[PDB]
Symmetry: C3
Subunit: 254 residues, 3 copies
């Protein structure tokens, strides 16, 4: 369901239902959740890389999973939301490599990467509105923050099929590279992050995730609390030492 | 005060005080609110289109009555903010066609459109600061979200006169078209929306309005609740049926 | 520590530790805080201009004291966050002139300007992550609001050195000017602002600072309250009169 591979501190997760364009099912989500939990808890893992097998990243919800049964969407989203909670709370950087179609919840999941890359030919389609649904799996939370409300309105209400270049223009991805180079570039970035100050990355992500709903006073207090934690890490000491010694730091994520 | 026209499920509202550049008055606002309430309640109205008659969309608050008594802007806004509430809460898509000058409260009203088009030659000026006032009618809420804090600061504090092309770059509008084609383009878009899944549009708008103030967990919960609702609509059933039957869907807005 | 000089309603504050690239210390913060309070409380000061003496605006926190004792960043930040509270709360416009390197907390401080100008050659580096720290001094609050979450993620996690031109494209600054003409242009803008409706500027800033955490209803209510206040100022009366009389207004900040 989800392939797992480790390389130099990087846990590579590959959605694996290629014949179905990695369409999402409860089984896939449970496997993805288990993989994220393992990655989050494995001290050897300093970074994660998420991508899709085959021609697409993920076409979103597999409509065949419903069959002829009646919609029970509020409950059905339980598996999606726990995966989103896990992604949002990762205490390690996540790189996402969008290799092809990313639509619906597939797009929602792709956008949770801290650093995102798309291959030439990849596309982003909100898609939900096309079948009379609303954005889910955190897309209504992430999209406005990532591309601004003006573009979020257009993307969600009109559901255009965005090219990789258009995604780069809006901030949906940070880089666009030739299809045959996507994974090498993404993995190279993930390995660099895997050598970085993991706790700083983790705590920085927490600040960003909670910043919009906080007053400046509350934000300053949170920065104080989290900086206090970061300041006590062995990595911070190493960081200061390396700077003074005019040498590269050797971080260990603690 | 406000002209009301109907066409293929689209309620077209035109601010009608061209001789005064559609200056905003309490009379105009009550008329707009009445029309919005009517459109919102009319099940046959699947979309709305708002534009201005004459040379401008709206030059903002009419200052004629100033000096007549002690300026009570708090009382005035508390009384008319219901118009903004109504605009933002429309359970159907709103298209705005900016035919010319949009300033002050005129700019505020124009920015409430879900999809916004501007005619070549149209302009956007925050204007409030020029007469010692702060942005109102939702502008302080919408501007930062639509164009980002950096640009909002500049536009509000310096109040430059933005061209239609500049507005497009900032995200104030989604499209710029020849003045003689503005209404044709806007109505075409509105009619397309009036054939779409109105409930999905409505609920998606609800999610966007709350996106920044909710925690991720609260957002995921609201998404699940609204998807549960959307999933029960006739439109969703049709959307899935049409997809499986490789044919176009025939949405009814329920 | 901090140079102070008044000029035509403008209080010019210059970080003064050029030999140390204006590296931030508690002593420097205490001086800046005192200067900010003075400008805030001085009714004759209607605009402030912040810049750095020497080749750099500020390279951020001075790491000289590190090692002397157990790192206590929460205590330190809780003690000096009052400086950021003061900056953000100024009831008058603040212009920032970034003359060179702005990194770490130096970047945090520069971004608090309402209108920001950078000299050709100036740069912006988040820097915190390079020594295993999280963004502080309000940077985690300001950055995503100013440039959006997508860009903020990239700037904070990878900490690239941003040129003045790239900072301009993103919105980190509103204008770029020759290094030799920076202060001239910055001071000119500040003096212009010092002639503007100070109360309108003050209340507008308040709305912007609090906008993201508020529901639309709360935002509309706050706009009503603050507009009521602005509407009572003599500057508003002058504003309306000047508009009717088709003449430039003569604001006094009251």
């Amino acid at each position: 369901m989800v392939l797992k591979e480790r390389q130099d501190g990087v846990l590579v997760l590959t959605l694996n239902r290629p014949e179905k364009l990695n369409a999402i099912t409860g089984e896939l989500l449970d496997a993805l959740y288990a993989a994220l939990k393992e990655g989050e808890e494995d001290r050897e893992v300093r970074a994660l890389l998420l991508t899709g097998a085959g021609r697409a990243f993920s076409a979103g919800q597999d409509l065949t999973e419903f069959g002829d049964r009646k919609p029970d969407y509020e409950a059905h989203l339980r598996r999606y939301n726990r995966v989103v909670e896990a992604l949002s709370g990762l205490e390690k950087p996540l790189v996402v490599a969008v290799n092809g179609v990313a639509a619906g919840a597939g797009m929602s999941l792709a956008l949770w990467g801290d650093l995102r890359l798309a291959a030439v030919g990849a596309s982003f389609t909100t898609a939900f509105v096309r079948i009379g649904l609303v954005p889910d799996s955190g897309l209504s939370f992430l999209l406005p923050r990532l591309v601004g409300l003006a573009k979020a309105q257009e993307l969600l209400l009109l559901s255009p099929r965005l090219s990789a270049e258009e995604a780069l223009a809006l901030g949906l991805v940070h880089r666009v590279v030739p299809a045959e180079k996507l994974m090498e570039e993404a993995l190279s970035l993930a390995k660099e992050l895997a050598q970085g100050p993991t706790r700083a990355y983790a705590l920085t992500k927490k600040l960003l995730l909670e910043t919009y709903r906080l007053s400046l006073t509350e934000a300053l207090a949170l920065e104080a609390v989290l900086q206090g934690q970061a300041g006590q890490t062995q990595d911070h000491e190493e960081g200061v030492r390396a700077f003074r010694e005019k040498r590269p730091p050797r971080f260990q994520g603690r």
